[PDB]
Amino acid sequence: NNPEYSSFFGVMGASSAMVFSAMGAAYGTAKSGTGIAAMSVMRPELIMKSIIPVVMAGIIAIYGLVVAVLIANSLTDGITLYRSFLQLGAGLSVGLSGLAAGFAIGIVGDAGVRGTAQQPRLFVGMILILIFAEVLGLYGLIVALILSTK
Template sequence: VPNMRPSLPSWSIIPVVMAGIIAIYGLVEAVLIGNSLTPRITLFKSFLQLEAGFSVGLSRLVAGFAIGIVGDTGVWGIAQQPRLFMRMILILIFTEVLGLYNIIVALILSTK
């Protein structure tokens, strides 16, 4: 059976790329926290960094689940109805923003 939609494989890679961007946000925060560690760190600063790490990890977990569910359902949907592509992208962008907002919160916490 010939491929009826040759653009479908390129559309299907978008959720994977967005999940990779979520991972990069976590890596950036891990590097920032790791570089700010010193031998004479205060307990307050340690707990702020721990809280920043937990918030980054939990928000990445939630955003990753959302991107996985929306990406899977969206790819199946655009295979049947290509007009759903833009709707899938909008929902993926909103789930990506969860990670972006939280990296701002984590940066504020880890730089106090």
């Protein structure tokens, strides 16, 4: 009744939502760590004032994980084409959104880490920018959970 290649699109989503999300994290924790390397010298006691971007990167990684797992949990052999397209679209959208969010968090973290190093009062304000990048992560998740059922 339905072709076997219908599986294609579906599980590709179950891959992509993970893959790209991880790439984003690989930029969030890395470049921020490079910034903390410079921060460590002038004032080594502000590591707790600079551990934010890495936790953000971990959060976006968790987002990718949960969408990928949920989409994978709805797998079956006789899946309809419609469902397959739905899963692929959701997975790709969340993956690329996670990638973009990771890029933004990494860049702003590297800037703000040394910015706080030179200027203490920047610190609180720095957090503000990070939160907005994190919001993009939320938004990706939303679409997937709007595409899982409907």
